[PDB]
Design an enzyme around this catalytic site. Sequence first.
Site, PDB file in Angstrom:
ATOM      1  N   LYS A   1     -12.156   2.705  -4.519  1.00  0.00           N
ATOM      2  CA  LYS A   1     -13.448   2.418  -3.825  1.00  0.00           C
ATOM      3  C   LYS A   1     -14.454   3.129  -4.333  1.00  0.00           C
ATOM      4  O   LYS A   1     -15.409   3.931  -3.837  1.00  0.00           O
ATOM      5  CB  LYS A   1     -13.216   2.902  -2.294  1.00  0.00           C
TER       6      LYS A   1
ATOM      7  N   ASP B   1       1.140   4.320   0.350  1.00  0.00           N
ATOM      8  CA  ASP B   1       0.519   5.491   0.948  1.00  0.00           C
ATOM      9  C   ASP B   1       1.418   6.749   1.077  1.00  0.00           C
ATOM     10  O   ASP B   1       1.636   6.885   2.211  1.00  0.00           O
ATOM     11  CB  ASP B   1      -0.253   5.054   1.952  1.00  0.00           C
TER      12      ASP B   1
ATOM     13  N   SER C   1       0.874  -1.060   0.206  1.00  0.00           N
ATOM     14  CA  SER C   1      -0.006   0.008   0.047  1.00  0.00           C
ATOM     15  C   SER C   1       0.881   1.266  -0.116  1.00  0.00           C
ATOM     16  O   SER C   1       1.461   1.607   1.234  1.00  0.00           O
ATOM     17  CB  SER C   1      -0.941  -0.054   1.344  1.00  0.00           C
TER      18      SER C   1
ATOM     19  N   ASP D   1      -6.836   1.926  -5.432  1.00  0.00           N
ATOM     20  CA  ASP D   1      -7.852   1.549  -4.277  1.00  0.00           C
ATOM     21  C   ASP D   1      -8.698   2.980  -4.253  1.00  0.00           C
ATOM     22  O   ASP D   1      -9.136   3.532  -3.219  1.00  0.00           O
ATOM     23  CB  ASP D   1      -6.980   1.606  -3.025  1.00  0.00           C
TER      24      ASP D   1
ATOM     25  N   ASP E   1     -20.711   5.003  -6.340  1.00  0.00           N
ATOM     26  CA  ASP E   1     -21.654   6.128  -6.918  1.00  0.00           C
ATOM     27  C   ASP E   1     -22.534   5.060  -7.630  1.00  0.00           C
ATOM     28  O   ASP E   1     -22.143   3.833  -7.990  1.00  0.00           O
ATOM     29  CB  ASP E   1     -21.098   7.256  -7.387  1.00  0.00           C
TER      30      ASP E   1
ATOM     31  N   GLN F   1      -8.432   1.797  12.212  1.00  0.00           N
ATOM     32  CA  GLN F   1      -7.843   0.867  11.810  1.00  0.00           C
ATOM     33  C   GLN F   1      -7.371  -0.106  12.842  1.00  0.00           C
ATOM     34  O   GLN F   1      -7.132   0.323  13.881  1.00  0.00           O
ATOM     35  CB  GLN F   1      -6.811   1.349  10.961  1.00  0.00           C
TER      36      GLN F   1
ATOM     37  N   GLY G   1       0.451  -1.121   4.401  1.00  0.00           N
ATOM     38  CA  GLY G   1       0.976   0.169   4.425  1.00  0.00           C
ATOM     39  C   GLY G   1       2.027   0.486   5.281  1.00  0.00           C
ATOM     40  O   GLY G   1       3.184   0.291   5.134  1.00  0.00           O
TER      41      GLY G   1
ATOM     42  N   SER H   1     -11.647  -3.555   7.137  1.00  0.00           N
ATOM     43  CA  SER H   1     -10.712  -3.577   8.415  1.00  0.00           C
ATOM     44  C   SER H   1     -11.153  -2.605   9.637  1.00  0.00           C
ATOM     45  O   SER H   1     -10.330  -2.758  10.820  1.00  0.00           O
ATOM     46  CB  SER H   1      -9.292  -3.628   8.065  1.00  0.00           C
TER      47      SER H   1
END
Lengths: 256, 256
Positions: free
Chosen positions: A91, A36, A34, A89, A94, A207, A227, A149
């Site tokens: 997500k 990030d 990840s 990622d 809509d 998290q 991450g 998560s």
Amino acid sequence: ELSFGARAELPRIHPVASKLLRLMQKKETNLCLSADVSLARELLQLADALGPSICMLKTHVDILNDFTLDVMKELITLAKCHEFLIFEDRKFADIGNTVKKQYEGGIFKIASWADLVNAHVVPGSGVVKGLQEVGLPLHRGCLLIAEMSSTGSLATGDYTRAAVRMAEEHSEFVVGFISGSRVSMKPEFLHLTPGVQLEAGGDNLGQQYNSPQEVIGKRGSDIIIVGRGIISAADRLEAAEMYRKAAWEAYLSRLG
Amino acid sequence: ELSFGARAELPRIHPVASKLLRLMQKKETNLCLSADVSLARELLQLADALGPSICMLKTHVDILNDFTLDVMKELITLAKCHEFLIFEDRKFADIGNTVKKQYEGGIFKIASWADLVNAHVVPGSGVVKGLQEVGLPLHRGCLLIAEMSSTGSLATGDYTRAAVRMAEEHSEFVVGFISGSRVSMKPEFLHLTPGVQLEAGGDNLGQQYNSPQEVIGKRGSDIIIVGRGIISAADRLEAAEMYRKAAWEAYLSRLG
Ligand SMILES: O=C(O)c1cc(=O)[nH]c(=O)n1[C@@H]1O[C@H](COP(=O)(O)O)[C@@H](O)[C@H]1O
Ligand SMILES: O=C(O)c1cc(=O)[nH]c(=O)n1[C@@H]1O[C@H](COP(=O)(O)O)[C@@H](O)[C@H]1O
């Protein structure tokens, strides 16, 4: 239970899933980084150094301060060199008509560079229909978010069952799940699990962490998404190797 | 039932909600334009011409082909001139640590220009906590997605009740809902309803339409969100006026 290499050959396997499963077995990695980070230079330096250790690099293109489509060109060069997939990622969450534009267009042109994206199932199957109208022609795959998560997640019980049904009814485009566990009994579907660290704990914003042994070995997932367990470490290469070895051995011990 | 002007003065009202309710009553508009266009010039020409007719302009910044922060500077000038709020329909739906970066940073810097954003409740309350750590200091508001307009929506029953509880427990930042109906009995909370057209129908990707009279008058919502019913019309100003008059009269007739 089949090896990743055997799953890559299943009759109903999606080409993106097949490519991923082949390189997982070849490289002995079921680790998704990840990435990030907010700087393109850090993203690309991580992708180059950790590329050999990972099956997949997960992006949040919308936290990158210096995004350009050229940064993603350089990321694709590294993905091809080191053999990993790119997973944005995003997500998507809509109505179908909106997500098709969010996937194909705007500044990011996600579908032009992302092997994989993911979507929430809460809007109903129109989210998948909209994405697949861009993604099928561009030979892409999608993951559905069946479990999360984070503390207070509502992705439980009937919700998780709805995600699995939606994936299975759209197997032309949906290649697997974001989940905490094996949720589908069909081996053609990838299980990717975030919320992973070697040590017990969490963050200050909901998290929750479980270990690679717990989520691959006991809960039956395929891939760990990591991450901060890597990114915040001083030596991100050795951190990636620790996570890779943990996830790979957990996988081997479940195979017997 | 209180008028928009009286709701603007409620003791527990959020400043963003108060500003919105004041300009709704002043301008006799409870119409939110869904400016679902890919060109900055079309977005700004719609914002200028329709500004007097709307309480709010809803953006999808990630479908704009020529986004720059300067386009949003020009949009803020129009929002101030014509008195409407800017709502970025980003549908944040990740863990708290991720959404705070997606809201503040990247190319879009959403929090710098958006009065309102929205979030899905499926990840749990961490999504709201993360957003509020950026949004509270920047004097912003948030809407929670309690119900959706699309076929197969899982935002029903206990899910909708969880969204209402989450909003009510985070009233410092959450000012209302995306919903199909009044879901909160607390008048400090705005109800905004998409999936609205004058005529019966839908789209090919799961969108379902109800009329302004149905959603404001019978279902008790506050604001209609209208995209294609206006955007696809030849005369977008007269279309906006038709939707404004419909939503406003439905509101007045519920007040008695
Ligand atoms: O889709 C995801 O990857 C995701 C789903 C989820 O349930 N939980 C979750 O943490 N994630 C993402 O996975 C990453 C977790 O990062 P760390 O907590 O730093 O390991 C973040 O980028 C999250 O946005
Ligand atoms: O958050 C939203 O506005 C939204 C929620 C929802 O349940 N349904 C829904 O249609 N929307 C958005 O509202 C707009 C609807 O546009 P039209 O169907 O063209 O009127 C789109 O931009 C959707 O992304």
